[PDB]
Subunit: 103 residues, 2 copies
């Protein structure tokens, strides 16, 4: 059945020339920071970070999340706790891909 809710999906790729250990530190710190946000950002219905484990793929980090509506996605996006979490990627990030869709 149709939920009338929104999935916010983001994939990130880090630069190729970042050392392995730095990619791991960044990815682990970002995953922890993001997954702690529900205690601080009330509109998050579900959130998780997945780290790529397929060596045939080149992107690094997936953020899978659910919100009631797009206003709530925007509330989350600019929330100070979320902005802090996103800065974790600032030095190493190469690309961001995002789709927001209804389910």
């Amino acid at each position: 059945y149709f939920q009338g809710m929104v999935k916010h999906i983001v994939l990130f790729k880090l630069r190729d020339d970042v050392p392995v250990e730095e990619k791991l530190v960044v990815m682990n710190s970002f995953k922890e920071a993001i997954e702690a946000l529900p205690a601080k950002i009330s509109v998050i219905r579900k959130i998780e970070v997945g780290l790529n484990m397929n060596p045939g793929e080149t992107w690094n980090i997936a953020l899978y999340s659910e919100f009631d509506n797009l206003d709530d996605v925007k509330f989350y996006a600019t929330h100070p706790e979320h902005v802090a979490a996103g800065k974790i990627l600032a030095e190493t990030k190469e690309s961001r891909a995002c789709v927001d869709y209804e389910f």
Copy 2:
């Protein structure tokens, strides 16, 4: 709980210069083709295609799916019915981003 399974998430961006009418035809056709695959491809545990509704984002299509393991993801990826679905995007695709992660 940890399921011992894999999420296969793919986002697509179509070329900027494709007329929006053909972008839409492609997006709809791809969504329909992917969503018909579970009846043909038994290893798909969950699959859905999301079409972007956020005009602040620039990627057009999300594929969200679940499999038992990466061997099954690869079985799905190479399956003739899946390849045909993927070809729907061939003429207009600009970028593909993918992360496969354990849950």
